[PDB]
Amino acid sequence: SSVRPYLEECTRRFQEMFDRHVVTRPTKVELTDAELREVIDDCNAAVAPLGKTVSDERWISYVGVVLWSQSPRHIKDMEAFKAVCVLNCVTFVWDDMDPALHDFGLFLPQLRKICEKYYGPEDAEVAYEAARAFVTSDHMFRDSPIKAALCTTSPEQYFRFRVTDIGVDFWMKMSYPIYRHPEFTEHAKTSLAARMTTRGLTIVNDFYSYDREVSLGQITNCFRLCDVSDETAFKEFFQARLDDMIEDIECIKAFDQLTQDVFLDLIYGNFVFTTSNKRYKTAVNDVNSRIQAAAL
Amino acid sequence: RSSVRPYLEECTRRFQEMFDRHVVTRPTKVELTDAELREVIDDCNAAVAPLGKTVSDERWISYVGVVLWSQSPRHIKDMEAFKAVCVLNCVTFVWDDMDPALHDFGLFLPQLRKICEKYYGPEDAEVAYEAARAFVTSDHMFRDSPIKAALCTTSPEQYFRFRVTDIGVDFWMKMSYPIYRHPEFTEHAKTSLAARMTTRGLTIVNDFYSYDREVSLGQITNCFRLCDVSDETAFKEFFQARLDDMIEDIECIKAFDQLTQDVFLDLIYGNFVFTTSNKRYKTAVNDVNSRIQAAALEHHHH
Ligand SMILES: [Cl-]
Ligand SMILES: [Cl-]
Ligand SMILES: [Mg+2]
Ligand SMILES: [Mg+2]
Ligand SMILES: [Mg+2]
Ligand SMILES: [Mg+2]
Ligand SMILES: [Mg+2]
Ligand SMILES: [Mg+2]
């Protein structure tokens, strides 16, 4: 199936939800041309050992999510920002890669290289460990019975899987050096930061990446828990997910002012990234195609 | 002065029937040698000594029972790592029981590091230390925090999300994986998926048996504060939803690899046996579970 029928009303329902509960719109980070090419050179170098080329356009697509979903008001360290740019893009290639291409012995050293270039010694270890856990999870769970069980049982089992699998725990553990805000750093390191933002990021991503994933046999998507064919059941389910996002956003506002800005800019920036970026406008295209092995 | 006392017998039997149906395999208590117990307690005294409060041998042994009951003795390979978890868990229980006036990070974090460096190799010691640091920093950070009030009063979902860290199960997995040297378990511990899978089963059990103590101390971190426990109908409907939660988690746990699921279920079932047998949960206020308090005249000359 597909959710294109619902695409227009749901975008509006999302946007109305954000306009009431978040209000402040996200704003896109503009990189200088130098900065952008540093990022892209760093990206190509990290995936090169894996034997696949990535166009400058596919990198700019990936990087949009970081340009839209950080918190410019509070940025203090732009070297850390660039690291998140590079780390997020290259793990995007991994997510799209056939597992045959997953070579840990070749790719884990490049991840460490990136982390040691942009972070101090401590932050580099934190970012690296989170990058390593993320690519290792994506690998381990292709065709895992665990993934099956967690994705088909209930929303509560599914979002639990997604704390790691969608990459938000990774994101927080590499983004906290951007802000050098002590409270935020601690919520990143306990993963409470990821836990608070997982549903807002996943429900949005799931709706707009449903068609791609479903075409590719990918089960990691909460709308597979309902009959998107049944208009009534889809509406009941969509509302419960919106309810989920609203409850999360309202608790987020108990966090200190800077932390809540970063959390809410992330959820909302990701919705803007996802509704505008080319990755999510069609199932298979030049920036979201499966990176295939190609046998012989 | 609310209480779940009237439900104690039926609730305990309902928990037990749930384990008999869904887990089946019983936990087994790890027996420590007299030497091993003494190394642990000596190491606990050393670590807390800089904080100026004495902890009795009886109270240590109370704390240590959860590790003796809730690890997975079928699969223990590293007893040095086992001893570290005994020590780390006991001394962070003390911290959990302490007035925050007593919380000296400068004094206590290096003692946590020393324990980790004693029992673990270098990489493992850093993972255990970081988890330990994160736990005591969370417990301290959230004493009368408005974030805790929001997460704990809003819904079960928000509450259990706070408890992944706050009950200490993430810390437990991240200091326990060296015991087993099992690769899948190690990865699940490092992603926190292991903690996430076991949070509700540990939290619901603990919350029921520590409710009376916690309401009496003003402590709001307990899911049964989300319902009117003096309302039998509302309590039983809430209790049954929490059993459903435990059952759903247990059944997904059984999709994990066999060793990992043995470890996950021994933790949840072992914690239930520890909780329903240990003096700590026998009464709300006693000499193994009383608040460890600072003295307002601790600085005095008499
Ligand atoms: Cl998938
Ligand atoms: Cl509390
Ligand atoms: Mg993925
Ligand atoms: Mg994907
Ligand atoms: Mg997706
Ligand atoms: Mg306590
Ligand atoms: Mg506590
Ligand atoms: Mg308790």
Curated annotation (Swiss-Prot), chain A:
Changing F134Y: Abolishes activity, no product. A motif (DDXXD motif) lies at residues 95-98. Mg(2+) 2 binds at D95. Mg(2+) 1 binds at D95. A motif (NSE/DTE motif) lies at residues 205-213. Mg(2+) 3 binds at N205, S209, E213. Homodimer. One of its GO terms (molecular function) is isomerase activity. This is Cyclooctat-9-en-7-ol synthase.
